Amino acid sequence: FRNNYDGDTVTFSPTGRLFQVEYALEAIKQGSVTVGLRSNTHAVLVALKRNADELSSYQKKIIKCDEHMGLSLAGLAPDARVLSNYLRQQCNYSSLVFNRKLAVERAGHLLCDKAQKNTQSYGGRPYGVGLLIIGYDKSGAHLLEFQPSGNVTELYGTAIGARSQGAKTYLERTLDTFIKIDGNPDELIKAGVEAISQSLRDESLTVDNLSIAIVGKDTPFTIYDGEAVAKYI
Amino acid sequence: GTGYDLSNSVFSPDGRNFQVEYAVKAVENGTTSIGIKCNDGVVFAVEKLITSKLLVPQKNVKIQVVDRHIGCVYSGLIPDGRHLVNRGREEAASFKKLYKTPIPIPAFADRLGQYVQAHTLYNSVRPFGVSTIFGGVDKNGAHLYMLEPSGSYWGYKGAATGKGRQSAKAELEKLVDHHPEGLSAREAVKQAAKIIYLAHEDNKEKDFELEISWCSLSETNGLHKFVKGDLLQEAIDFAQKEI
Amino acid sequence: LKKGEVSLGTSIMAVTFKDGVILGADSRTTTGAYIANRVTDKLTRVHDKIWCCRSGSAADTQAIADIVQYHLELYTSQYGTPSTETAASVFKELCYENKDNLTAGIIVAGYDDKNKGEVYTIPLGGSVHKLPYAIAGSGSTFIYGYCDKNFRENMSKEETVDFIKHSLSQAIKWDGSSGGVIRMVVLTAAGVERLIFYPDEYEQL
Amino acid sequence: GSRRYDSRTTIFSPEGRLYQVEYALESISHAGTAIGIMASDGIVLAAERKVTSTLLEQDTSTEKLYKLNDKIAVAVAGLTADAEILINTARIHAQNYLKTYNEDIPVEILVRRLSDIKQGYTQHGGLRPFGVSFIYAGYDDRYGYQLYTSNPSGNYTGWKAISVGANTSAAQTLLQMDYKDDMKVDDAIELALKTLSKTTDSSALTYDRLEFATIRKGANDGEVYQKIFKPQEIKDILVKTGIT
Amino acid sequence: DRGVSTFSPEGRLFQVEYSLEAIKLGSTAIGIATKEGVVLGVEKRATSPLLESDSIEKIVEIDRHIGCAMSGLTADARSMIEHARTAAVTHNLYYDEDINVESLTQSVCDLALRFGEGASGEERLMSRPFGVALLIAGHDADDGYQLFHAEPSGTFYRYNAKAIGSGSEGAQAELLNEWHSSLTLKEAELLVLKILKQVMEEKLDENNAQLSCITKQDGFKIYDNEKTAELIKELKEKEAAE
Amino acid sequence: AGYDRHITIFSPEGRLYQVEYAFKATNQTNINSLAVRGKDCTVVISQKKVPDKLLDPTTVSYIFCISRTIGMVVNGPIPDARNAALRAKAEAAEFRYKYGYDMPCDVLAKRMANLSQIYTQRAYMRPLGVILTFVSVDEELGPSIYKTDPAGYYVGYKATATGPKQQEITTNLENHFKKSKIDHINEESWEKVVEFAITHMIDALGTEFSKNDLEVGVATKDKFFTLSAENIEERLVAIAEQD
Amino acid sequence: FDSEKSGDREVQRTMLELLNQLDGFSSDDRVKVLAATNRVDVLDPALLRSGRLDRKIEFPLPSEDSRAQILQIHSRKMTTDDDINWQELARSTDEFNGAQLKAVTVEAGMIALRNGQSSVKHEDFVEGISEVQARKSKSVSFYA
Amino acid sequence: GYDRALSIFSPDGHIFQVEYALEAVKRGTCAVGVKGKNCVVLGCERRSTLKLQDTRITPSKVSKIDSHVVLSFSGLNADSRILIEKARVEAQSHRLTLEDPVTVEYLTRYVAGVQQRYTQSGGVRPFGVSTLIAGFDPRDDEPKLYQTEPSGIYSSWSAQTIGRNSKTVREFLEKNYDRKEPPATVEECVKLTVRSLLEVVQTGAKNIEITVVKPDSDIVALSSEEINQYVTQIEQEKQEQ
Amino acid sequence: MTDRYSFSLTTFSPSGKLGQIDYALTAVKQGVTSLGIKATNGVVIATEKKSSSPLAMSETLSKVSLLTPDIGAVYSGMGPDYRVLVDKSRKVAHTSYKRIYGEYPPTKLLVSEVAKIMQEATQSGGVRPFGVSLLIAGHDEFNGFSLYQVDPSGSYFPWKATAIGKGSVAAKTFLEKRWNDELELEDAIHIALLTLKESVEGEFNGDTIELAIIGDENPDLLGYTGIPTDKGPRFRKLTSQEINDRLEAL
């Protein structure tokens, strides 16, 4: 249960941790699985959407902020709007002032700098949203893992969500495999689909449950949904 | 009365602020990071811990650069140090804009310390939980300062924070005693690698990854850059030789 | 330059040499047709080893000198000892944005133990440059022929003062807006010394 | 966090009344008593200053009756410090009304302005309500004499006879029996003096601790004469009332 | 009380956790999505027979092509409805076209996450999240007839058939098997009346429930009392068939 | 309730508890200093405690020169001391700019005391954790020593003590001042007052000093500076050979 | 502590007696004394001094490999399977303190028994992880 | 300045401040209003605890917002006249902006909106008043009676009462008033309103104030000498039957 | 960021009395025992300077100050609070009268204006009431000599003779017999010296007594000669030498 030191975000535990941030990270854990991975020349996101009931819909867990970038969701939906809007503002500012497409690492730095100022000052709350930024710049394909704590790191692949982290082992066993795969988007997407399948517990993958995005040089950022994703099922 | 640690600006009966102490205790739960003040410049070093192998090697970095001659290496709450170094970069940019002289190291220290303490005066701001080993080379020479979350900074001849903070300082003292007249940067980088290896022995359970960087006048002529190529490997296997 | 406001003009000049830099000016302040003060001073001590002279509107020059004094004292109090380029920097930054209102020409020169003596001039626009010598003011428009040919590098103190008088004599005699006594400042490793000339001697040559 | 030290001044109680104005209405009872009687010929305002001693200055000293306009005067019951700001704002508002309309400000307008000032603090801002209640007296061509009262809550009602302060109930009960609709100024004055004598906590009634303000209209028509009874004239009515 | 925008150990924010269950204290609003349009119905719940049926309006029209129902506490949605109408009309002015229903819902649900103290970086003020859930319904030229659910948590769903409020669990269960993609508008109205009757407190008439409709040609329309009465009679005929 | 002791609010005994606890924070460094007033100059001497060998002795000091004429010695945690030094330097700048003449010590002390009082009165602010000793020579008034406090109570002193043993040094100097009946040292040379202060400090603390244990600040006529280590060693040698 | 109203002056007797037995005139220097407190911020300064308890060993929350070692140790008696990935389970638990892992093992066994399985699997362990954790409420997947 | 939120969602879903304002209203003076074919009557009582309150300068319980629409309140009297001032200034602004005299529906919507905003804005407690709005729209003879709650919910009532003992007046109106057959005369409406009041006021003919609103900019306030006239035959017809 | 303490820190207790006001009164009643009495031809305000440490200089500390060359101020509470109060009061008095009217305000309006600040302090959120009690003495050409006492609550009372501090009860209960209708300045200063004699607990001399007098317009201290309109400041303060002459006059 909540303790005395919960209060507001500006408060240190005697052990030396922020309970607000920890609660944000737990809410990150509670969300659905959105495993993603990248190759030398391609970046693939795989998302498992959730429906309230049979007569319901699915959340767009894949948000596009530019043609050379993309986003994934692992938590609170409304704050994802704010985060995506900020990322789009900075991408458009880069386009209009520098002409340079925003570097993926620079995007992660901006996102962490934004996420800080709620946890640093009174009146703010941490962004309980987990971004898996993908993109491709002149350097190469990149992938990040954003956290409400402000921690941002670049990885070949990861999975944030309910029992999603149980699907990291599939990536780790095949980490040496999908890295050396270049210019082969369909099979990389197939490997990603195999990765998420390990995180299934009750219901299998269907047409309306799989949302897939992929970016690259020859392949711009494209979101797959509906019948367009059944070929990879 | 109880609750003397709930708020920030409250003084304890013995006169010691309590949120700052908890921030200090949060600092120690961080990756070790040392810095050596060689004769011509400074040599930083970090021990970014390799998590599950999904993390890409040699890509995530922690030695942030300010201007050209000031380097920042931080431990503890990494994002908080990110924001601190961001404000420091803004201050250096303003100084160079309205003075057109590169910011001297003690001036940067004063600016960062004044910013840090500004966050431990109020009740509506959490004190920083990051300790920095920022330093570099200026006109008058070389300086290496460690900043603490209480806002106190000192002109160290070498410092280290992290899990292996205590072990690192012993080897720092041994290095200082072994070379009282001074130390060259070339040997300083190898000594820094050795010190980090000795400190990492506490965290031998998890894998390590070493990144090092140095600012100097003899070679880098006041420019800050990392260590790449055969020099890093030479330092690594020299430090592994004695093991 | 407004209508009726007090302006300095005249001539200011500073020459570098081996032991430092000697900076010169006059004591005449001509306001339009009239001469208001003939014993005034155009030399401003922004720092012990950093000196600046004033040209243009009197009030504007005095105000910018006061602001530069404030900023320089802040710098020496907190950060460290100043230098010539910092003194020129604060002047340029003060003059730049308000160039529509503030319109004056400033020359700053200081001596240091590392780079010896340097001279930095701020024209009306507000740029900064480093020169062995520099002139400013309406009265300075006439000696362009003399000083450039008679200037030498790494001279000595006696030759520098001889050149300064042999250059300001034409400034005083050829323009009525410049006159009165001739004021000298010497910046060397020994220290700052104040020297003043008289109208009856440099005219007699 | 700047929360634990907040007292939540503007908070509704579980049953549903405010609590700060509730205690302000208790602070009112601990202040000096005041009396206001509405007579046909004029209005009499009297108050008994609290904390009186031989060293209290009486030559030029008015702490309960204040002048806001040549026609309108008020009686203060409560914390004089908080009443000072309200008095200044009322005077400013009256002078602004004279600025805008060039005609004497009716009492109701000023009473509303002060009630609104009190209500604004009782509503928002998180500040403690003013712990002062006023007694308003004035004249105009609209309704003739007017005698309102104020509260820390900011509500005002008209009264033919009021007494706010210590022993309010006793004073009201005493005055209600003797109040008619046809007194002159002198009858109201003697009634108020008798009420103050019968409600005071001391033994005798000395002229030092009594203040009087009266509104009279004589030969001159359209302008009443506002006189703050000085001690030299104050000691005169004591023998007329028989208290001496 | 302690904290306003504070999180919880379970990881869901407060207020919105309370607001998500405060809707059940309100009325019952039911909508059904058909290829021929969307049928909406509410529960007036006159606290006394002295109330007026035409007084309390729990169904509003954001636009000719978009209308919504109401549930929970009604007062807070007035700000929601004003902002939604302003957004729709401003989009029409800016882009000389009707605003897409999903975009309008998105532009509405963002307001549900503005509670906070001392907003920094921009001037935005709100004490608590709105405690009202809306059923956005309308037609568009790209997807067709839509029925959304403007939750107070900032999230929204496209819904084929939804009940919110008191019957959010009782009526919703019946909608699972009573809905099909071949449902017609007439049978949709009959089913809505039947489900309301099942969830009715008192007898159902033109004074106790108010219905509406959205169509591609007729647009938004509030059903009159006479047609509601004949719908009641038709439902009465339908229920007792065998 | 019990929230009285947390913020600067009055207490059943009529006391400001937070300001009271602020004083206990001034003795954290346990650094003892004293300042005497010469016939024409002033000298302030403070213990210079370097905890670790990694410290650079030059940068660690509790003596800050406020301006070319006003010096200041501050006791307490250093970061708050540096904040106070920054504000004092900025305010000396502002006064010199606005009024055109160098300010006397009393004006600066009064302004800092007023700032500390504003800190105490405002609830959202916390009081300064330092005790500042302003020392200077005033051609308008004479040599002067001014000591403020976190509360804002400032008053000129014939001779100031501080630290954990402030009372003992106070009595040690008071015996001399009450036997000699003079309000200042009669030694004309700034050379002699330094040895006088060092001798009294040594007899008071009962300790013997080296080149690095004590830092001495001297304020002559229109000049303030900090003596280097060789100067202190020469003074100690002179004291040792003289007595 | 000093107090004139009232105090716990009885327990302080035992505290000072323990202090005098640890150090003072009697040592005997052959009686080592271990002490395992939980709140070191409350202990009297005298009891924390040297001469008395000297070594102050800090017990931190288990490291990443430490969690795997703990799970391996506490899953010996139970009939485990041969496909349990201890590394994955150890990573799943984050700031889990000791007995919070034994509780995980017990809950996984209990879930496996409840579902009728004759031996635990990785799924039962994950379900136990969710059971023990701050998801003790769980349920309600609303709005993620 | 003050940014702290005062209205916080309770764990059971209600807002504690709003439901406390409900009780704050429940302690106010009883105010009742009924409407006929072309007449609406707003009846109200006054406090009888203290006497010697004059009538001329005593603020009327029913405050005139405009020539065609009037307002009556119950509960905290301090806060209600602020709503009265805001409604009046908003009505003048509406006249300036739309060149049309205000309607009852629009004014009631505005009052509900301002109460809703105060329940929404931070640092401000909700109003402790409940208001009744009555009047006639321009060029229309239909009386409209509107009730506004501190929670912000407004509704039309053929006959509604608020304040203390409002349950008794409500049940009385539930049987001696017909919604489908309203009284046809001003006298009948006044008689019904008066007879409703004696069920609670139980003497106090001096402090019973009644305002009768008529179309075509006709708002009157019946004096005591007429109210006691109605009371005469009302009490005469009470006990004998 | 700003100031998050926008709420009032003074809250009405259920007993009906202000907490912080009744707490500042307690903080005032302990401390330096000051006094001031009014005579026919002038007003004398006296206080004792409790030298905290004997190495300090009581000369640097000004226990009494000059609000205006006619009006002086004496306090009995907390030092820094009184200093800030006196600076603010001088500033606002200048702003209100020297800028607008052209001369120095009289005592009656100046006292109300300075008490405005304190009565705002007990009202404005996030701040605590001033812990000082002010004794204001002044003269004017119409109301004559007047002495005013300002309490931390902001209430000011006109008093012919007063005393605030530890010895307030004894001095107040002893001043009635001392005082009568007709008095002289030397008589008043002797009365004040006799009253303060027992209330002092340290060394008694000219250095430990801070004494000021408002009397006739002395032209020597005016600082210029040639204007018959003004004749000098009426507020003068005795030095140690001045006061140790009437000290043995007892």
Swiss-Prot record, chain F:
The keyword Signal does not apply. InterPro entries: Ntn_hydrolases_N, Proteasome_alpha, Proteasome_alpha-type, Proteasome_asu_N, Proteasome_sua/b, Proteasome_subunit_alpha6. It is found in: Cytoplasm; Nucleus. GO terms for cellular component: mitochondrion; nucleus; proteasome complex; proteasome core complex, alpha-subunit complex. There is a cross-link at K223 (Glycyl lysine isopeptide (Lys-Gly) (interchain with G-Cter in ubiquitin)). The keyword Nucleus applies. SMART domains: Proteasome_A_N. GO terms for biological process: proteasomal ubiquitin-independent protein catabolic process; proteasome-mediated ubiquitin-dependent protein catabolic process. Gene3D superfamilies: Glutamine Phosphoribosylpyrophosphate, subunit 1, domain 1. PROSITE patterns: PROTEASOME_ALPHA_1, PROTEASOME_ALPHA_2. Pfam families: Proteasome, Proteasome_A_N. The 26S proteasome consists of a 20S proteasome core and two 19S regulatory subunits. The 20S proteasome core is composed of 28 subunits that are arranged in four stacked rings, resulting in a barrel-shaped structure. The two end rings are each formed by seven alpha subunits, and the two central rings are each formed by seven beta subunits. The catalytic chamber with the active sites is on the inside of the barrel. Interacts with CIC1. This is Proteasome subunit alpha type-1. It comes from Saccharomyces cerevisiae (strain ATCC 204508 / S288c) (Baker's yeast). The gene is SCL1.
From Swiss-Prot, chain G:
Transmembrane segments: none annotated. It is found in: Cytoplasm; Nucleus. N-acetylated by NAT1. The 26S proteasome is involved in the ATP-dependent degradation of ubiquitinated proteins. The regulatory (or ATPase) complex confers ATP dependency and substrate specificity to the 26S complex. Belongs to the AAA ATPase family. This is 26S proteasome regulatory subunit 6A. It comes from Saccharomyces cerevisiae (strain ATCC 204508 / S288c) (Baker's yeast).
UniProtKB/Swiss-Prot annotation, chain H:
Keywords: Cytoplasm, Nucleus, Phosphoprotein, Proteasome. Pfam families: Proteasome, Proteasome_A_N. One of its GO terms (cellular component) is nucleus. InterPro entries: Ntn_hydrolases_N, Proteasome_alpha, Proteasome_alpha-type, Proteasome_asu_N, Proteasome_bsu_CS, Proteasome_sua/b. One of its GO terms (biological process) is proteasomal ubiquitin-independent protein catabolic process. CDD domains: proteasome_alpha_type_7. The modification Phosphothreonine is found at T58. The keyword Zinc-finger does not apply. PROSITE patterns: PROTEASOME_ALPHA_1, PROTEASOME_ALPHA_2. Its main location: cytoplasm. It is found in: Cytoplasm; Nucleus. The proteasome degrades poly-ubiquitinated proteins in the cytoplasm and in the nucleus. It is essential for the regulated turnover of proteins and for the removal of misfolded proteins. The proteasome is a multicatalytic proteinase complex that is characterized by its ability to cleave peptides with Arg, Phe, Tyr, Leu, and Glu adjacent to the leaving group at neutral or slightly basic pH. It has an ATP-dependent proteolytic activity. Belongs to the peptidase T1A family. Present with 16800 molecules/cell in log phase SD medium. This is Proteasome subunit alpha type-4. It comes from Saccharomyces cerevisiae (strain ATCC 204508 / S288c). The gene is PRE6.
From Swiss-Prot, chain I:
Transmembrane segments: none annotated. SUPFAM superfamilies: N-terminal nucleophile aminohydrolases (Ntn hydrolases) (SSF56235). One of its GO terms (cellular component) is proteasome complex. InterPro entries: Ntn_hydrolases_N, Proteasome_alpha, Proteasome_alpha-type, Proteasome_asu_N, Proteasome_sua/b. Keywords: Cytoplasm, Isopeptide bond, Nucleus, Proteasome, Ubl conjugation. Disulfide bonds: none annotated. Gene3D superfamilies: Glutamine Phosphoribosylpyrophosphate, subunit 1, domain 1. GO terms for biological process: proteasomal ubiquitin-independent protein catabolic process; proteasome-mediated ubiquitin-dependent protein catabolic process. There is a cross-link at K108 (Glycyl lysine isopeptide (Lys-Gly) (interchain with G-Cter in ubiquitin)). It is found in: Cytoplasm; Nucleus. The 26S proteasome consists of a 20S proteasome core and two 19S regulatory subunits. The 20S proteasome core is composed of 28 subunits that are arranged in four stacked rings, resulting in a barrel-shaped structure. The two end rings are each formed by seven alpha subunits, and the two central rings are each formed by seven beta subunits. The catalytic chamber with the active sites is on the inside of the barrel. Present with 7060 molecules/cell in log phase SD medium. Belongs to the peptidase T1A family. This is Proteasome subunit alpha type-2. It comes from Saccharomyces cerevisiae (strain ATCC 204508 / S288c) (Baker's yeast). The lineage of its organism: Eukaryota, Fungi, Dikarya, Ascomycota, Saccharomycotina.
